[PDB]
């Protein structure tokens, strides 16, 4: 489409939390879960509204 575009990668984010592994009582033992949000930034420049 003839649009000036650059690309970069912002640093990823990793959100981690921890939950009790067992059901009743095993506080010493946990499971750690994480969510990874990876980013990609496309910077388009000098393009009209349409």
């Amino acid at each position: 489409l003839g649009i000036s575009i650059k690309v970069h990668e912002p640093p990823r984010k990793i959100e981690r939390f921890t939950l009790l592994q067992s059901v009743h009582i095993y506080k010493k033992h946990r499971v750690q879960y994480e969510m990874r949000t990876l980013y990609r930034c496309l910077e388009l420049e000098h393009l009209t509204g349409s």
Binding site: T18, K27, K28, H29, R30, Q32
Partner: protein, 192 residues
């Protein structure tokens, strides 16, 4: 000699440890028997192979000849620029080193690379360091300065610095805390 896994991959079969040892001993006997090239290539079929790259010198607007490198230590990253000719001046983040590093240990760490190759006062250094603490920044600047100075010392001095540890990046970083224990290794007080 290739490991048992490599031999199994080469022969697409499964071999025991004793079979591998027998084959290795036979190959060693072949090598020690003054084998010719026809057998030396056969040996090299089963042979597996076991230096630091140096940045080139650059030139600036002022006309000085310089090299630039970078290093890291813990959570600190530093970039150093060492000029071929200077007077021992080191400026960190635009600040003189004796002011940015009041601790004598950090200044000694900065001195260590130039002192090792006997080049105190023979260069000028500009460093930009970010992250970590005073000692991590000092170590990162030391590593970056050594890597940049490799471009001006002889190859023998480069090897000597590598043997002195001035060029190896310290992989020792903070170990993550694990659940169920106080720290990275400190377990909770074991009750009875």
């Amino acid at each position: 000699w290739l490991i048992k896994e490599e031999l199994e991959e080469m022969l697409v079969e499964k071999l025991s440890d004793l079979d591998y040892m027998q084959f290795i001993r036979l190959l060693e006997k072949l090598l020690t028997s003054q084998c010719g090239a026809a057998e030396e290539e056969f040996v090299q079929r089963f042979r597996r192979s076991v230096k630091q790259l140096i940045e080139p010198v650059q030139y600036d607007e002022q006309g000085m000849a310089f090299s630039k490198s970078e290093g890291k230590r813990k959570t600190a990253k530093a970039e150093a620029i060492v000029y071929k000719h200077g007077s021992g001046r080191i400026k960190v983040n635009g600040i003189d080193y004796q002011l940015y590093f009041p601790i004598t240990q950090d200044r000694e760490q900065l001195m260590f690379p130039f002192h090792f190759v006997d080049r105190l006062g023979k260069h000028d250094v500009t460093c930009t360091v970010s992250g970590g603490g005073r000692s991590a920044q000092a170590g990162a600047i030391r590593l970056a300065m050594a890597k940049a100075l490799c471009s001006f010392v002889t190859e023998d001095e480069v090897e000597w610095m590598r043997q002195a540890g001035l060029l190896t990046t310290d992989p020792r970083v903070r170990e993550r805390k694990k659940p169920g224990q106080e720290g990275a290794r400190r377990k909770f007080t074991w009750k009875k």
